[PDB]
Amino acid sequence: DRINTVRGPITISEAGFTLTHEHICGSSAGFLHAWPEFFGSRKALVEKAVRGLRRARAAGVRTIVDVSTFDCGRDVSLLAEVSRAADVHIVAATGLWIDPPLSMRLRSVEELTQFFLREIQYGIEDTGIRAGIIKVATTGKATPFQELVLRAAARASLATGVPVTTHTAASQRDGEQQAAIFESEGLSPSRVCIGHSDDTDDLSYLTALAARGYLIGLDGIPWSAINASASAILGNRSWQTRALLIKALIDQGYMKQILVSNDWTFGFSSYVTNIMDVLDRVNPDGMAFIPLRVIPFLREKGVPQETLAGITVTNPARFLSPT
Amino acid sequence: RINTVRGPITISEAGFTLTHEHICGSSAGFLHAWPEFFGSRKALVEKAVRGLRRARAAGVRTIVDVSTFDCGRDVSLLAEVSRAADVHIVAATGLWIDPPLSMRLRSVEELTQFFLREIQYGIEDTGIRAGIIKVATTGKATPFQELVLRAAARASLATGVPVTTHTAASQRDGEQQAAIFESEGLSPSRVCIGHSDDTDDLSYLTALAARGYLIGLDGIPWSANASASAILGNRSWQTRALLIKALIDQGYMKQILVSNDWTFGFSSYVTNIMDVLDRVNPDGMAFIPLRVIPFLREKGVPQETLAGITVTNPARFLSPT
Ligand SMILES: CCOP(=O)(O)OCC
Ligand SMILES: CCOP(=O)(O)OCC
Ligand SMILES: [Co+2]
Ligand SMILES: [Co+2]
Ligand SMILES: [Co+2]
Ligand SMILES: [Co+2]
To answer: Residue A153: which CATH number?
Structure first.
């Protein structure tokens, strides 16, 4: 009874192979509840999510961390249903993403701290489900509100021991501004993951954050566009280029600071209409891309099996553990 | 028949109707995720029930809650308060000033499907159908706001359900809204140009009323630090109320819709705004029948005209045609 999941508290050993940055549905607050037909139906979305996590479990995955926040349309009741049906542990998230509504964006740091603490200590909505991770975001230079979210995330993390994970515009080196704000609040670097870090080839930026104790979120491995709307989100860099960054950080002695994931989803309303149809053709493996296509690739390049097992099992366990 | 949060009602059951009100001004999913922001869900229900009972004792029989999906409309809350207070509440579809990513990236065809499902099928999984479409512009319409107005027009034309708007009246938004609605084939009699009491430009108001539009003089009690005087304004309630008399004197009594634009919870603004609002207007939703109606009677407006504005006009507006 260490890590909080959508099914209740589980132990460190029960976690196993863990994908640290995933989504069941990328949406907006109240959207799935108000317009389920957008995704065909709520039943069609549940079935697509259950089939996907079952194929991921058959490939080796035992736990996924759903980093969808309130404004990313997190519906913990959906997460609970798909978790139970697929028999895969799902860790829920609190925090705020890139689309906070007026009722969230006009709040103070004290109020946001109360909201984050409520979702971790009491529960999310009326479900009783407690969050086991805090997700925050910046897209370049932090807005005055985003600074308050990062400070509230840090204050909520120090009071509960629950980790913090971030969304970044990696090419603009956001991890450094996020890191500076977290440390100004007294938050330990070992409790933070700088996500979307595989969107850049700047190894100097990655190794420096890793040297301070930060976990590097190399979470968008299958995202490649090799269509203006699809190119702007997937990027023009291959999956191999993103995957070689895992090898590059191991070679420099930072195997303990790596967190790998797919940043996959089954429903996607916070982008263009038929993006889910384009995404499932680029990567038909889905969340099963890390154990099926990325792990045997790194084995062919010379990376040992024990260090890859240390990145997928030991690192997320230490990260998700309340300390 | 008009759809309410408790089901369909006849034109006669509507009675004295306030056409632009809110039980709670919030954001989508907010009340469900953070009810303690309002003290508790129970505290918000209790405040709303007492406020609606005060409105009922003053003569109000129906309120039109113009809160949209993005304004945090919770029809289950509206249903609970309507039952306890014995006041009919008409719910709304449409989009307000804060659409999230999943809404702002949608096409006109997709938004039309959404507005239609809330009117024809129901809101969420509640079975409660919307009886009005709420839209918004804050100055010149953004490309997205133009799509919302067109989708609102298409939803209205397929159902007969009316359209009510939010405007930046000082910038004369009603003229552009009118042009967009008319380009879609929407009859002016199915549209209310709201927040029209935010301007003293009578020429702009009469020009729209002459074309057949309903003029929403909906923020009568809104009068005044920085955050307070920003939305409230420097003009008195009497100046806002005299716009009702000014339009009757020009022969447009049938084109007037009056309301308070009140709320019992407000999270989509600064923290203790509710404490500021409750002292500016202690009457709440009872402001229109308790203060505005006797004021207009003192100025020479007949009771038959006032009953025409508060009972006849809203009934004709809400009735699907
Ligand atoms: C996946 C949907 O959310 P996101 O990770 O912010 O999108 C960019 C990868
Ligand atoms: C919640 C009410 O929002 P609004 O009617 O746009 O503004 C009221 C002054
Ligand atoms: Co992200
Ligand atoms: Co993500
Ligand atoms: Co308005
Ligand atoms: Co309003």
So the answer is: 3.20.20.140
